């Protein structure tokens, strides 16, 4: 593939997010690195405008699937890396069951040798006392399967999956994700056969950090073929 060679080593990552949820404007910056050979990501995020108005876990999916590990026999299906370095646009609507929804738009591409994910997020119709604005979510994260299928007319892919966020009372808050990725360049991209990415993430805190933040370690590997 084209961009495949761009991910052979450890690649630095820079994340920029501007958000507005129910009238509360905020920004998050993140830095770290990704090692696609092992499907590994290590990143630290900071809310640069003060306290984050929504729970950090709700932003995980939004805050670079080109770092997923694709087994050798599945390389022909790696759309994400095939779109580099010009990049792809990734859009989503995230529906929080019995609550609001996030609508996001991001561009992920290389700037020099840094992989950048620049995102705009708008959150609407959230209940002021629901699990999100009420900060009722536990600070942890579950493993999920992310389903990918080709969208040939759009020369891109459609992705869909459900995230299960543990709530403090033992219950669960579901977040249905609908995603569309399209290439930024005019060049060719690899359009995949159906498959999924198996994801696991662990959230932690930097004991020395006084700003509102989240440390994230994540492993993602492709499967299903």
Residue-number span of the structural domain to which 82 is assigned? 1-225
In three-state secondary structure terms, 15 is: strand
Q: Total structural domains in the chain? A: 1
Can you spell out the DSSP letters for 32-94? EEEETTTTEEEEEEEETTSS-SS-GGGGTTT--GGGSB--GGGGGG-HHHHTTTT-EEEEEEE
Q: How far apart are CA 79 and CA 77, in angstroms?
A: 6
Nominal resolution in Å?
1.9
- Please say whether the beta carbons of 87 and 115 come within 8 A: no
Solving technique: X-ray
HEC secondary structure over 133-196? CCCCECCCCCCEEEEEEEECCCCEEEEEEEEEEEECCCCEEEEEEEEEEEECCCCCCCCCCCEE
Q: How far apart are CA 63 and CA 203, in angstroms?
A: 13
How buried is residue 132: exposed, middle or buried, by Cβ count under 10 Å (0-12/13-18/19+)?
buried
In three-state secondary structure terms, 205 is: coil
Overall residue count recorded for the chain in this entry: 225
Work out the number of other CB atoms within 10 angstroms of the CB of residue 48. 14
CATH number of the domain to which 206 belongs: 2.40.155.10
- Please say whether the beta carbons of 6 and 36 come within 8 A: no
């Amino acid at each position: 593939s084209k961009g495949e060679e761009l991910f052979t080593g450890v690649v630095p990552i820079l994340v920029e997010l501007d958000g507005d949820v129910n009238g509360h404007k905020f920004s998050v910056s993140g830095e770290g690195e990704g090692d696609a050979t092992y499907g590994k990501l290590t990143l630290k995020f900071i809310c640069t405008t003060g306290k984050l108005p929504v729970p950090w876990p709700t932003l995980v999916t939004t805050l670079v699937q080109c770092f997923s590990r694709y087994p050798d026999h599945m390389k022909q299906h790696d759309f994400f890396k095939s779109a580099m370095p010009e990049g792809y646009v990734q859009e989503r609507t995230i529906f929080f069951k019995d609550d609001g929804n996030y609508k996001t738009r991001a561009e992920v591409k290389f700037e020099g040798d840094t992989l950048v994910n620049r995102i705009e997020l708008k959150g609407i119709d959230f209940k002021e006392d629901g699990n999100i604005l009420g900060h009722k979510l536990e600070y942890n994260y579950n493993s999920h399967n992310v389903y990918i299928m080709a969208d040939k007319q759009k020369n891109g892919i459609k992705v869909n999956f459900k995230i299960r966020h543990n709530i403090e009372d033992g219950s669960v808050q579901l977040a249905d994700h609908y995603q569309q990725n399209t290439p930024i360049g005019d060049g060719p991209v690899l359009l995949p056969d159906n498959h999924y990415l198996s994801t696991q993430s662990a959230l932690s805190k930097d004991p020395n950090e006084k700003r509102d933040h989240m440390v994230l370690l994540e492993f993602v590997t492709a499967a299903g073929i």
